Curated annotation (Swiss-Prot), chain B:
Subcellular location: Cytoplasm; Nucleus
Highest taxon, organism lineage: Eukaryota
Role of this protein: Acts downstream of various receptor and cytoplasmic protein tyrosine kinases to participate in the signal transduction from the cell surface to the nucleus. Positively regulates MAPK signal transduction pathway. Dephosphorylates GAB1, ARHGAP35 and EGFR. Dephosphorylates ROCK2 at 'Tyr-722' resulting in stimulation of its RhoA binding activity. Dephosphorylates CDC73. Dephosphorylates SOX9 on tyrosine residues, leading to inactivate SOX9 and promote ossification. Dephosphorylates tyrosine-phosphorylated NEDD9/CAS-L.
Family of this protein: Belongs to the protein-tyrosine phosphatase family. Non-receptor class 2 subfamily.
Post-translational modification: Phosphorylated upon activation of the receptor-type kinase FLT3. Phosphorylated upon activation of the receptor-type kinase PDGFRA. Phosphorylated by activated PDGFRB.
Disease linkage: LEOPARD syndrome 1: A disorder characterized by lentigines, electrocardiographic conduction abnormalities, ocular hypertelorism, pulmonic stenosis, abnormalities of genitalia, retardation of growth, and sensorineural deafness. Noonan syndrome 1: A form of Noonan syndrome, a disease characterized by short stature, facial dysmorphic features such as hypertelorism, a downward eyeslant and low-set posteriorly rotated ears, and a high incidence of congenital heart defects and hypertrophic cardiomyopathy. Other features can include a short neck with webbing or redundancy of skin, deafness, motor delay, variable intellectual deficits, multiple skeletal defects, cryptorchidism, and bleeding diathesis.
Residue intervals of the SH2 domain: 11-111
Known partners and oligomeric status: Interacts with phosphorylated LIME1 and BCAR3. Interacts with SHB and INPP5D/SHIP1. Interacts with MILR1 (tyrosine-phosphorylated). Interacts with FLT1 (tyrosine-phosphorylated), FLT3 (tyrosine-phosphorylated), FLT4 (tyrosine-phosphorylated), KIT and GRB2. Interacts with PDGFRA (tyrosine phosphorylated). Interacts (via SH2 domain) with TEK/TIE2 (tyrosine phosphorylated). Interacts with PTPNS1 and CD84. Interacts with phosphorylated SIT1 and MPZL1. Interacts with FCRL4, FCRL6 and ANKHD1. Interacts with KIR2DL1; the interaction is enhanced by ARRB2. Interacts with GAB2.
Tissues in which the protein is found: Widely expressed, with highest levels in heart, brain, and skeletal muscle.
Lineage: Eukaryota, Metazoa, Chordata, Craniata, Vertebrata
Domain remark from Swiss-Prot or TrEMBL: The SH2 domains repress phosphatase activity. Binding of these domains to phosphotyrosine-containing proteins relieves this auto-inhibition, possibly by inducing a conformational change in the enzyme.
Name this protein carries in UniProt: Tyrosine-protein phosphatase non-receptor type 11
Length: 93, 114
């Protein structure tokens, strides 16, 4: 039971990923997309926030032929901490 | 609770989201400016946020570092270990932390809580 669900790379360039997760039945206030190079992950990453009304994002400025780990978090404006059980995937290039 | 308490340090901001941190390091920080804040994914754990770019909206780019406390010592996932975050911070002003995400990670000026 992850929140959100079904994270996948929809489309990719050598330097950019187009990701999507389930626009769900039960909505949240925001999402935080985190990403980093696998092997340095989870100790080094970059991140950005999107509203809960969104279920897609682009991660750009990446390098070709590199393994990346991407984790999406869900959150509430009424909590400092993210919801437990985020969802995570790997993708190279 | 299991490592030296760094909450009295001036570069410690406590509750501060990644978006808030990015705004701070942008509006007042330079390249290599850093702050420590509490993790939002791991309660009680710390995050070192480092400005690593000027540009990417009119916001700057921040790389984030997970701080691990294990067996009374601090590290950033590997390599050297420190009795305090203050010692860790000083070491990574003089030494590079890592090269990742197309940027060389090294500390410069702390961004202090106001």
């Amino acid at each position: 039971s992850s929140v959100p669900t079904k994270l996948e790379v929809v489309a990719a360039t050598p330097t950019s990923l187009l990701i999507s997760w389930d626009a769900p039945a039960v909505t949240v206030d925001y999402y935080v997309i985190t990403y980093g190079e696998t092997g340095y992950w989870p100790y080094y990453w970059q991140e950005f926030e999107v509203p809960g009304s969104k279920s897609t994002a682009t991660i750009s400025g990446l390098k070709p032929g590199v393994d990346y780990t991407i984790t999406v978090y869900a959150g509430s404006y009424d909590s400092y901490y993210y919801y437990g059980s985020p969802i995570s995937i790997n993708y190279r290039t | 609770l299991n490592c030296a308490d760094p909450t009295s340090e001036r570069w410690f901001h406590g509750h501060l989201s990644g978006k808030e941190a990015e705004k701070l390091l942008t509006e007042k920080g330079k390249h290599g400016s850093f702050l420590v804040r509490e993790s939002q994914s791991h309660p009680g754990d710390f995050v070192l946020s480092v400005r690593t770019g000027d540009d990417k909206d009119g916001k700057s780019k921040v790389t984030h570092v997970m701080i691990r406390c294990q067996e009374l010592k601090y590290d950033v996932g590997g390599g050297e270990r420190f009795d305090s975050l203050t010692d860790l911070v000083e070491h990574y002003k003089k030494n590079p932390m890592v090269e990742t995400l197309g940027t060389v990670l090294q500390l410069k000026q702390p961004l202090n809580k106001e």
